[PDB]
Symmetry: D2
Subunit: 246 residues, 4 copies
Amino acid sequence: GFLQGKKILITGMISERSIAYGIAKACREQGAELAFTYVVDKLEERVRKMAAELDSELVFRCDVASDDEINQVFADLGKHWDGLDGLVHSIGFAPKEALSGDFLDSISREAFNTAHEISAYSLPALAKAARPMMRGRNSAIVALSYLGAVRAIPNYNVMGMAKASLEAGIRFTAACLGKEGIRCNGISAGPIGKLLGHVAAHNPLRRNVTIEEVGNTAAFLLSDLSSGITGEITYVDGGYSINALS
Amino acid sequence: GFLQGKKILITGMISERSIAYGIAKACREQGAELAFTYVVDKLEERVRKMAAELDSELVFRCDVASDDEINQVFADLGKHWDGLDGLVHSIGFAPKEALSGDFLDSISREAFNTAHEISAYSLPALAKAARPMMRGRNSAIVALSYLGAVRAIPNYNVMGMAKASLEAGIRFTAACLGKEGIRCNGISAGPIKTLAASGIADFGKLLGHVAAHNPLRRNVTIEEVGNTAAFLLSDLSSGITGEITYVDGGYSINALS
Amino acid sequence: GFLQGKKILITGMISERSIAYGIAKACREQGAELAFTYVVDKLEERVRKMAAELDSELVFRCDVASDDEINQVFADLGKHWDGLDGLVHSIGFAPKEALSGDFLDSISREAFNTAHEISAYSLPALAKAARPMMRGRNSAIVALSYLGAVRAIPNYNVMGMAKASLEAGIRFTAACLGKEGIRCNGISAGPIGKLLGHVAAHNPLRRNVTIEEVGNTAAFLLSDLSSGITGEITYVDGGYSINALS
Amino acid sequence: GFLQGKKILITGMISERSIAYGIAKACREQGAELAFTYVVDKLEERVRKMAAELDSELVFRCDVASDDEINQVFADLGKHWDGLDGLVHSIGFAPKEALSGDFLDSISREAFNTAHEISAYSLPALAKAARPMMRGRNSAIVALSYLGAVRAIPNYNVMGMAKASLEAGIRFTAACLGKEGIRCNGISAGPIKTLAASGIADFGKLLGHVAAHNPLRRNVTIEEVGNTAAFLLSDLSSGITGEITYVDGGYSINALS
Ligand SMILES: NC(=O)c1ccc[n+]([C@@H]2O[C@H](COP(=O)([O-])OP(=O)(O)OC[C@H]3O[C@@H](n4cnc5c(N)ncnc54)[C@H](O)[C@@H]3O)[C@@H](O)[C@H]2O)c1
Ligand SMILES: NC(=O)c1ccc[n+]([C@@H]2O[C@H](COP(=O)([O-])OP(=O)(O)OC[C@H]3O[C@@H](n4cnc5c(N)ncnc54)[C@H](O)[C@@H]3O)[C@@H](O)[C@H]2O)c1
Ligand SMILES: NC(=O)c1ccc[n+]([C@@H]2O[C@H](COP(=O)([O-])OP(=O)(O)OC[C@H]3O[C@@H](n4cnc5c(N)ncnc54)[C@H](O)[C@@H]3O)[C@@H](O)[C@H]2O)c1
Ligand SMILES: NC(=O)c1ccc[n+]([C@@H]2O[C@H](COP(=O)([O-])OP(=O)(O)OC[C@H]3O[C@@H](n4cnc5c(N)ncnc54)[C@H](O)[C@@H]3O)[C@@H](O)[C@H]2O)c1
């Protein structure tokens, strides 16, 4: 496995449908040792169960709204691990009412603030707090984005602005940390209900992508095989974004 | 002029170095009738004076931190104008300390929040509040962005994230309002010496570097940005929406120069 | 008119449906003085008629396959004009059989060569030959491209490669000539038969663009109003390219 | 390895400095079985020797100027392999004189034609000729591009146009073959000291500049490019097609550094 020896912290795994679960599974198959965060105490048992199945008992509460909690994750993780080789950002949130219907009607200041804070600021926040553990290790950060960053899409609305902020965050983080041996890259994943049918009917592959396909791309981006790649957004959408008038 | 009789609301004009002043002047030269906002009471006299020189006495206070103030602008403007043909977003802010040195060291939650709220959310916020006055008119919105949206750049730091959010905001606003006959476009301007620009550490170096490295071998002017905005606000650009146009003398498309 | 005093050479005007005609009309409405090329002697009378309606009697034969003919246009034009303020490239060609069906089946070496030579090399070829007349005048070049440069599109096939070469040509020409006061920009126009219905149903404006809308954008890019813009591809497609999953 | 038993044809390997050698080595480390092409008879011995070290004795002459030769490669390869899982395009050329100084002065019709034919048409030409052997296998194609596709760069000149054509070729090939289970992706590599690179005037300056200005503060290696290619040739990347991946240490996304 090309992640043998790599210690990787994975955020956002709340079920076996999660993109973060696909990533966790892919990484574990390549020999990585894993740790996980969970947003609220309600989910602890569920995440520990999933973690145990991936041979891990390193599970920490982390609401990225809280600087204290973010920093506490690494303080706790540092008691088990000498350093951190991989960091997976697979976290996004916006109020449901902002993700429906007319873009301007659905938007509000508070929804904008929440979306950006949780979905975009969380990348640099986590990179900043992880920096002591990651620097000098030839380590890597991977974050999940979506086509809404660069195209107007129905319903995605304010989340598109937040993903754009995120992708820029990826570039600035990469430029910031490259000299000290930390890479930062993004994956823009295809959708994973009629929207699914649209993508599958319109993309070069004529099908939707899987969490395994996203997961394997993340595993690659977290490994030394991708050591020449930083500040990149890789599209795992079966070529959807590069097709038009299909 | 190609904006003859078009009614245009311009934000962000605080001096004759302002990009918004360049835009205002360009629009007025093409026959537009103008109105202006100003962020705080301390600037009112200055902005009224500048407005008067551009043949306008429609001036309104607007801190885009405040939904009350944003919406009040259009309630007040509506007493004078039956509709609005143009809206110019030329507003940005981030705490100075976040715009200097190492990206992660300089960033904070609060600075991120402020930068995005003032510099990015303000676009849809203004479009939303202007929508009743603009819809059904073949009207247009223009906002100012910067290369930090799409490239990592020293010192610009968290503002780059905010500009990226803004540019996506431009696309989503365009997609949202196109059916109602309102267009929304961006201009990514090259560096220009303005009050806000002096907030960025080592700005004079960015300016010197661009002039030495762009195809035109010089920096752009507020007039050049202004004329591009005037075009994007006019019916001449009626086939263009959701676009970011680079007015940077070709800097962004050059490398290893 | 914002093109008063501007002398502009326009290629590719073969009918009043031509994008080049829209450009010519738009430019003339803003006060420009025009000249025209035509590819073959068969079209001379038609183009002279159109030119006369746009108040011009400066019409020259030019097959861009021929260096001699390209250079001869400027030798002849130079007897009437002191300099050249605007150059409009609105020329594209590929064999019809390469523009239908499966991309690889439809392609051939000869079709590729022809498409690129006529549709892409013609930009630098014309810029090169115009350079003595255009330099130091604060002049401008505009070329027409299409979404096939940057997206895979059905049927457009090898022309997509040629347009990509063209757009890169625009950037390299802009970088080359900027110091001597010549700008070079592109317009990526929307389509102008079911494809039309698709774009009109899917773009932000919910309609197709007109030759007038393309023409006015060209007029702007040829004027001093756009003096801060070079090496740019401006999309006049009603926002189609920036929309997805619509 | 993640390419265990995958059969991969590699073009463009003429020395151990070649990007194609880096790719070949990376693929072989992951269990792939390899075959190689060489442009002229004068290089045959060298390429056979290199191939033998990568456990291969499948070596074929192919000048991509010739449709006969391109198609003959697959006719000959088909005697040994029942199908093809991977195809690597690592070939480029333009006359030296077109790669030096002023873009327009240096360009000519003939140089343009040659550059595009050898460097861009060769991708679809090879994909087309490989199609019967590759279809229905979940196979993959990888081609090498450079930043000149999307930025104006000194000296690269007409090659930039050719690389742009190539990248569009990658997208069109991907859209064409996806239904048959063949993927097609590109790698835009940072500058690397190779035989072909020495064709570009002032290449050593491009190399020095990139290392001083990219996020990683160093140039990339053929191993880094090679491992990315191996990934793109494998089932691990089965969700990726029509993509240009930048292996340049983040150079293209940095500005004003
Ligand atoms: N599924 C898709 O179609 C798709 C496509 C592209 C990108 N993405 C992105 O991938 C990422 C993962 O989403 P998913 O599709 O696996 O959905 P998911 O619900 O499985 O995962 C989203 C995760 O974000 C976490 N989260 C939300 N608020 C948080 C907070 N305050 N602190 C910490 N964690 C918080 C949730 O707990 C959840 O585990 C998201 O960033 C999403 O935008 C998803
Ligand atoms: N000058 C440059 O180099 C440059 C380049 C590209 C883009 N821009 C952008 O152009 C726009 C205008 O900036 P400028 O360069 O003319 O500087 P400027 O200082 O003249 O204008 C900035 C304006 O933003 C306004 N503003 C700040 N906070 C506000 C708030 N809470 N409410 C309302 N208004 C507020 C200021 O009052 C000021 O009028 C900004 O979006 C900036 O990011 C500037
Ligand atoms: N109509 C569209 O949908 C559309 C959209 C985007 C871009 N474009 C581009 O706009 C340009 C103009 O095309 P159009 O749509 O007006 O079609 P058109 O047929 O009106 O114009 C194409 C012109 O190219 C000229 N041409 C062809 N071969 C030539 C040669 N060897 N020498 C000189 N001239 C030659 C033709 O004579 C013709 O006048 C083309 O480059 C085209 O690709 C068209
Ligand atoms: N070295 C770099 O800095 C760099 C960076 C990005 C991309 N690239 C690209 O990588 C690819 C490989 O180049 P490299 O850097 O390994 O140089 P190289 O000299 O090792 O390889 C170039 C190859 O192209 C082959 N070639 C040239 N003309 C040919 C023809 N008519 N038929 C068949 N093959 C032919 C040569 O024989 C040689 O094997 C090229 O596409 C190049 O443009 C190189």
